Structure 1
Amino acid sequence: AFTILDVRDRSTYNDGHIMGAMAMPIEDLVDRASSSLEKSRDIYVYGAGDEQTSQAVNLLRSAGFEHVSELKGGLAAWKAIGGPTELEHHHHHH
């Protein structure tokens, strides 16, 4: 149906992301999406805040993706409606 892209820092993605969302940080977004997804695919993106989200949507649309929409409120808005999330294995040297 549609693909979900998390454009936040990969470190952030690891701490929790929308279940099934793909990790595609802003800096590598156009490259990865261009090589992994067809431009006719319905894409839904969320980042850390409205600003970063908008930036990502504009980058994808300018790259030729025909259907790119924003998930308003991002991860917080998603958890607010009881949506599923996943955390990734990683460690901290802190």
Structure 2
Amino acid sequence: AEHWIDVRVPEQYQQEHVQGAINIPLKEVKERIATAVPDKNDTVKVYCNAGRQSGQAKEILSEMGYTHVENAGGLKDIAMPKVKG
């Protein structure tokens, strides 16, 4: 019960992202997460370039009543395998 959602602008996703994450920019995520992850108990890990937009995303999704949100920071601090542009 986990997913990784890059809430960053999609331009930077095409340069680097975590291996096996989705990109859905923050402003779409607040709708489109309901289509991608209708199970609110799934661990939605949110990340971006640096943490600030994913920090906001964690709060936004907690407000949307997702019961298992996690903030994963930003791509530089995340030390998971990557794919690049």
Same fold (TM over 0.5): yes
Larger strand fraction of residues: 2
Q: For the residues of structure 2 that align with 1:51 and 1:84, how far apart are their CA atoms? A: 21
Q: Is the 8 A contact 2:50 2:75 kept in 1?
A: no
Letter in 1 for 2:27: E
Q: For the residues of structure 1 that align with 2:62 and 2:53, how far apart are their CA atoms? A: 14
% identical aligned pairs: 27
Larger helix fraction of residues: 1
The structural deviation recorded for 1:60 is 0.8
Structure 1 residue ranges without an equivalent (≥5): 89-94
Q: Show the 5 A alignment for 1:1-80.
A: 1-37=1-37, 38-72=39-73, 74-78=74-78
Q: For the residues of structure 1 that align with 2:51 and 2:6, how far apart are their CA atoms? A: 13
Structure 2 residue ranges without an equivalent (≥5): none
